[PDB]
Design a protein around this ligand. Structure first.
Ligand code: RKD
Ligand code: NA
Length: 331
């Protein structure tokens, strides 16, 4: 708890006295889209002076307001510039014009983890274990800031050139969009509009590990309603190739009973770290990035993007009238 005790202090220092790294939008050349979302997209950009590459998130200000995500966006930004953790995406710069918010992020050239997963079918248990370790640490870190990841979106788990995970989200403090739309990853307590705490993240961890090891999520159906029924049921078919160690962990993680769910017990996350499945895991070496990654992305070019999918390229139009000024004044 040495690396996290201080990185909690560092968060508060940076929170309260933010840096003002200065670039201008005009310095970045838009190249191609790395991903799309509800209220924007992430462009790969090249710095016109250095030739260095970044991932620029472009949010339409109006669409953020029309979907009531202002507070979340402002918060997400402030959290992100304040955190320094090895498996969280750094914010480099941020700007705004009339139409858009712009957030220049550190580029993770290895693409989304789940495109490597579809490509190879399923991860081996060491391979899955390697990634899960980073997530555990990331979740432990986020928890020490009273942040909760809540909804796992595995499209948001990126891979860097060293083959380590970069997580793109920072959770929430304290949307039927998410419930109805992305159902496979919801914890039971969220489906049944009960309370939820840090323990939903350990459910998410369970789903993630299962999907990595299996190649598909543990609760799947055609209509979302059936999925909900499965999640709350507390019943999961394990593939036959799952070790009994893995099966055991997943029963404890995918526990519907909050009070018995691993991570949420007396010893907290140490239940998880000291599980037989993680016996071979050097937690310090993972944090310090000294474990050799099982997959290292192939770097064909300087701004090579073949590790991300293709997307249609909208024109980034900018109004000559400032939109949503007061709303994003503090952004
Ligand atoms: N998978 C998440 C999304 O695709 C994304 C796309 C649009 C929006 Cl509004 C939010 C998130 C994404 C893609 C790439 C990156 C990225 C690449 N390098 N560094 C960050 C981050 C998020
Ligand atoms: Na404001």
């Amino acid at each position: 708890k040495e690396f996290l005790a201080k990185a909690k202090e560092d968060f508060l220092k940076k929170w309260e006295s933010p840096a003002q790294n200065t670039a201008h939008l005009d310095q970045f050349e838009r190249i191609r889209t790395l991903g799309t979302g509800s209220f924007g997209r992430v462009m790969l950009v090249k710095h016109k002076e250095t030739g260095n590459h970044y991932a620029m998130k472009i949010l339409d200000k109006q669409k953020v307001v029309k979907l009531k995500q202002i507070e979340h966006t402002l918060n997400e930004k402030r959290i992100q510039q304040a955190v320094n953790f090895p498996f969280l995406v750094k914010l480099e710069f941020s700007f705004k014009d009339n139409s858009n918010l712009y957030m220049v992020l550190e580029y993770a050239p290895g693409g989304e983890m789940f495109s490597h997963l579809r490509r190879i079918g399923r991860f081996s248990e060491p391979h899955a274990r390697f990634y899960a370790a980073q997530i555990v640490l990331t979740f432990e870190y986020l928890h020490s800031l009273d942040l909760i990841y809540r909804d796992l979106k595995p499209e948001n788990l990126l891979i860097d050139q060293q083959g380590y995970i970069k997580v793109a989200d920072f959770g929430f403090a304290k949307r039927t969009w998410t419930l109805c739309g992305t159902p496979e990853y919801l914890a039971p307590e969220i489906i049944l509009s009960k309370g939820y705490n840090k323990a939903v993240d350990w459910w998410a961890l369970g789903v993630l590990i299962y999907e990595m090891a299996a190649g598909y999520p543990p609760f799947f159906a055609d209509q979302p309603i059936q999925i909900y029924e499965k999640i709350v049921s507390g019943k999961v078919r394990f593939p036959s190739h799952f070790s009994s160690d893995l099966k055991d962990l997943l029963r404890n993680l995918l526990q519907v009973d909050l009070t018995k769910r691993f991570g949420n017990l007396k010893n907290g996350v140490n239940d998880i770290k000291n599980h037989k499945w993680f016996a071979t895991t050097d937690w310090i070496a993972i944090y310090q990035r000294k474990v050799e990654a099982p997959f290292i992305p192939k770097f064909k070019g300087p701004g090579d993007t073949s590790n991300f999918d293709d997307y249609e390229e909208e024109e980034i139009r900018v109004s000559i009238n400032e939109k949503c000024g007061k709303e994003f004044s503090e952004f």
